């Protein structure tokens, strides 16, 4: 079948195109496909440092003091409340410089983001409430794991669900 | 497609059922349609749409496609093995001691009210 | 300058009127972590 298959593939005029695809593609400086370097390079902070052949405008020099400041914030889950603007702004500048942008976030982004956030969480908790009672109760972790087994399209996988399946402790401990 | 059989040959799987090539080709068509659709949206986005502000002219460079694919794999497509996450997470679990007890030659079950008692379900 | 916690408690006191008071240490932490992940992914 293999020989006959190759012969029939040669029956098509694309035998020439098939003959040319012998090299190693990605004719670039490279596209690594390993794992550990993806991880590391996706773990260290980057820095948007710029060239200046003739003129690279922007009128505001690039800094990486911002990235350190961003990674140092008392982010959520330590504190007990959703972050107020200032914390979120400090974290964003870090991410924007860390991805390769420049210029300061303009104080409307934070608010629309908070808005979308609280909408998200109201949806989730409405789901859990729809689980526990049909029509004086009090809610637990297991109900939220149940509803994130039923509806997983809500949350993006990674990070937290694995962490969620490592917090379900037994009674005595 | 015969080339799909040729691609099957790479993984030592010469035992197909002949529905697979139809199905996977259908799949790739669906996938790339969605991909180069939202990439076209982003090409519009660089072209500063609303209820009449400018035209819509297509180039579709590779960067837009890269954007349209990274959003998909943001919630799909089993990624690189997330080892470090699992290592630290499991160290957090692998922290509190074993029970260090003796049920004395039987089985030790969870307490009833955590056991199931698989009776005929009834109202 | 200007003369210088009730966000989640308001996010949940307005959902229901039959108690349904969530617990910290188990549930609240989950939600804070979800919010963090959401903001990071979106801004990226």
């Amino acid at each position: 079948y293999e020989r006959l298959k190759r012969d029939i593939l040669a029956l098509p005029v694309r035998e020439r195109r098939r003959i040319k695809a012998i090299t190693r593609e990605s004719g670039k400086k490279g596209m690594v496909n390993s794992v550990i370097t993806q991880t590391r390079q996706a773990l260290i902070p980057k820095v948007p440092v710029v060239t200046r052949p003739t003129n690279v405008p922007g009128n505001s020099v690039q800094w990486a003091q911002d990235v350190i400041h961003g990674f140092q914030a008392l982010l959520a889950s330590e504190i007990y409340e959703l972050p107020e603007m200032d914390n979120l702004r400090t974290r964003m500048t870090g991410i924007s410089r860390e991805h390769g942008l420049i210029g300061p976030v303009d104080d409307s982004v934070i608010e629309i983001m908070l808005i979308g956030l609280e909408q998200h969480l109201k949806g989730i908790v409405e789901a859990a409430i729809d689980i526990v009672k049909y029509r004086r109760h009090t809610l637990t972790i297991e109900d939220m794991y149940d509803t994130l087994e039923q509806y997983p399209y809500l949350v993006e996988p990674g990070g937290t669900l694995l962490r969620l399946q490592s917090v379900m402790l037994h009674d005595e401990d | 497609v015969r080339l799909l059989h040729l691609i099957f040959a790479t993984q030592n799987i010469y035992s197909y059922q002949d529905h697979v090539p139809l199905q996977l080709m259908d799949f790739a068509y669906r996938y790339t349609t969605g991909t180069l659709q939202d990439a076209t949206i982003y090409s519009d986005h660089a072209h500063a749409s609303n209820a009449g502000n400018a035209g819509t002219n297509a180039q579709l460079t590779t960067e837009d496609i890269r954007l349209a694919i990274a959003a998909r794999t943001n919630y799909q497509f089993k990624p690189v093995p997330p080892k470090e996450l699992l290592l630290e997470l499991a160290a957090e679990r692998n922290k509190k001691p074993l029970p260090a007890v003796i049920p004395t030659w039987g089985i030790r079950l969870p307490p009833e009210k955590y056991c199931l008692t698989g009776k005929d379900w009834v109202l | 300058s200007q003369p210088s916690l009730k966000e989640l408690l308001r996010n949940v006191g307005a959902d229901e009127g039959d108690g349904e008071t969530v617990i910290d240490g188990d549930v609240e932490e989950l939600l804070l972590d979800l919010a963090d992940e959401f903001v990071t992914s979106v801004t990226s």
Partner: peptide, 26 residues
Amino acid sequence: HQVLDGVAKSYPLPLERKVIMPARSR
């Protein structure tokens, strides 16, 4: 003939991969 078997060594790639890395760990 066998020339095409020797040529068929594509080694395809993706464009982008995700990396599951939360904020807290890093």
